[PDB]
Amino acid sequence: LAASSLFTWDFDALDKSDEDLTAVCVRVFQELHVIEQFNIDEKKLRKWLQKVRTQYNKNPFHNWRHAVMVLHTTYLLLTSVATEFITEVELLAMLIAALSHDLDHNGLTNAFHINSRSELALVYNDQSVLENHHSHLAFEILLEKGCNVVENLDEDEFKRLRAVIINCILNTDMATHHTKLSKMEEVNRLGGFINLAENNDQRLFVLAVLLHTADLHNPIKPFESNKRWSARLQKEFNNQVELEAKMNLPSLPFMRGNDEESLAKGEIGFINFVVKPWHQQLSQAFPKLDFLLDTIDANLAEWKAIAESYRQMH
Ligand SMILES: [Mg+2]
Ligand SMILES: [Zn+2]
Predict the structure, then answer these.
(1) What distances in angstroms separate CA 91 from CA 4, 73, 79, 172, one per listed residue?
(2) Are 122 and 115 in contact (CB under 8 A)?
């Protein structure tokens, strides 16, 4: 399949088999030339892709297909916006970070770990509990001898690659969303990003911004994809509500809704207060991405129509 046919904005891993998903991940490494750049052993790349997939759990949303969605979307974002400042090391780092960013997720939020006083919350002092666990596991898999995709990087390259993987995964925590939004507003106020290839700190910030954008792939896909994934996330929220009840823990109110009306109500709130203001800042810094505002508006209108037919049939 041609690259411009596989690498489009309508891709959804939901409709693919495990065999095809492994193939899609390989193609992403092929097209970005990171294999020949760092002499990646394809036996270790295939073993790493296998251990990452099996290290994901079978949740409705936070599963291996979500990780492939994030990688594929990250491929599109970097290809469209970052090809003229991202380094070869950072490009490989973003591939490992996208695929590993939700390793061992169990469908439970950080708040669950903090409220339940879980082992993970104790180890990580309630700070970005899930994301710290994902990143830690990412290197435990990556640094097994038979999976060392980055075995040929020298000392300084691996230090940069590791710092990029850590920072990007940690910044998928929604608790740092508004931190990155405020920095993004300040960047757009003085004209946008300049000399990104000279500024390793701000370029790393851009990468974190892009991985976070790719993580929120539901409102920027066709509405059929948006609906299926959002409903799978809603199932995780309702599942956590049930578990929190059995444990006699407090539950957040928006996780209790379990029908189509409350699903549309919630996604309209998520788009209007998280995704759309985010992509309005992203589009200013990167005008090549403002076509996603049209996808977000299209899905928003489609969600508003559903919530309208429920207002009517009172
Ligand atoms: Mg996550
Ligand atoms: Zn994620």
Answers:
(1) 19, 14, 10, 18
(2) no
Instruction: Tell whether 215 is in a known binding site.
Output: yes
Identify the nearest ligand to the CA of 130 by its number.
1
- The token pair at 100 is 């590993």
CA 117 to chain centre: 26
Gap from CA of 102 to ligand 2 centroid (Å)? 5
12 among the known binding-site residues? no
Dist. CA 227–CA 303, nearest whole Å = 9
Is 18 labeled as ligand-binding? no
**Hey, what long-range contacts does 248-255 have (CB within 8 A, 24 or more apart)?**
249/112, 249/115, 249/116, 250/115, 252/111
For tokens 């030339």, the residue is 33
Experimental approach:
X-ray
Resolution attained, angstroms: 2.3
- Helix/strand/coil for 191: coil
Ligand nearest to the CA of residue 214, numbered in listed order: 2
Cα–Cα distance for residue pair 104/107, rounded to 1 Å: 9
Rounded to the nearest angstrom, the distance between the alpha carbon of 22 and the centre of ligand 1 is 21
Task: Please check whether residue 113 is in contact with residue 158, taking contact to mean a CB–CB distance below 8 angstroms.
Answer: no
d(CA 192, CA 171): 21
Residues involved in catalysis: 62
